[PDB]
């Protein structure tokens, strides 16, 4: 696929790529201030990197690439944060689990997606505020020494 992208369209149909050569020489000739977001089930608190204090333990490990039940994605291992993804109420963790999205139009679907965005960002913010995430965990002094010049974890 990389070779095809580099060259060879339609099995050496033509050399017109040199024309696109000139192309790489062509481009070098130089409303929400409301608190009605409500709340959604399905997510309580991110714990892929361990439970919040006082809680201890609960790590999540990466998933091996060479697997059959999962890992059909030939890419790298699955990040633990992606595993605790908080898909929202678009999917339901029922007795066996099943999607509750069958008879909806585009507008309500996009509204649910926006609500999922809202919940995800709030949860990530509060998770990184306490400094329990590995990347957010500084050394044992204030847990905020490596703070960005923006007042953010």
């Amino acid at each position: 696929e990389f070779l095809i992208k580099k060259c060879g369209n339609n099995s050496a149909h033509g050399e017109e790529i040199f024309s696109e050569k000139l192309k790489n020489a062509e481009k070098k000739c130089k409303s929400c201030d409301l608190n009605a977001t409500n709340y959604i089930r399905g997510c309580q608190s991110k714990t892929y990197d361990g439970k919040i204090f006082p809680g201890k333990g609960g790590e999540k490990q990466w998933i091996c690439k060479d697997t059959i039940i999962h890992g059909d994605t030939n890419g790298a291992c699955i990040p633990p944060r992606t595993q605790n993804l908080c898909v929202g109420e678009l999917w339901d963790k029922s007795y066996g689990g099943r999607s509750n999205i069958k008879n909806d139009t585009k507008e309500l679907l996009k509204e649910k997606i926006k609500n999922a965005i809202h919940k995800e960002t709030e949860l990530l913010y509060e998770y990184h505020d306490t400094g329990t995430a590995i990347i957010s965990k500084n050394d044992k002094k204030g847990q905020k020494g490596k703070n960005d010049p923006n007042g953010l974890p």
Binding site: R41, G42, Q44, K51, F53, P54, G55, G58, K93
Partner: protein, 224 residues
Amino acid sequence: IRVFAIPPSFASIFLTKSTKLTCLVTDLTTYDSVTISWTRQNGEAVKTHTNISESHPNATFSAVGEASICEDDWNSGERFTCTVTHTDLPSPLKQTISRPKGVALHRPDVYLLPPAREQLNLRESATITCLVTGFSPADVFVQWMQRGQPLSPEKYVTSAPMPEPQAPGRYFAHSILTVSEEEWNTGETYTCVVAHEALPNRVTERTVDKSTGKPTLYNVSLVM
């Protein structure tokens, strides 16, 4: 013209290790410099209040009144008086407050119920109930403890005391603590502490986890 003389609460005096008695005047004429004196039933005044508030939204000046004494005198049932003198009132207003002596005492008992097993099927949330019953008088205090660390005062809600059906003099009360589901599979022991006057040590402790009702003698398992 209305003065409220609120007696100290059991929880407040328990946590502060001291007692405070406050009577405040409201609905009077809007004017400061109101002389409030906290005296005893036998007529012995103490230090007055401080930090008098501003006027109410209804154009009434709000005057504070408070005092701090030793709890031993409060146990004696002394009808401590607070005398209020103001320009509008022709004669000083006096009210007496004291503990309501003459009440039977019974030891409360405390039980702790885990979340319903059926509720642990949505993987959304769970509730643990700390129940207190069989006690007199009212005004019990409940707090929640996890692994020895205090919890936020809004993650749990306690009900109000109400009379027992059978026993006329005894009462009961409920407290509920909400928690997520996944960490209940570890347990954290989620302890409950109860403070009541009639208790011999005034503090009682209970705990539970997910592995509490297990037989703890044989480990039988099933697999396909």
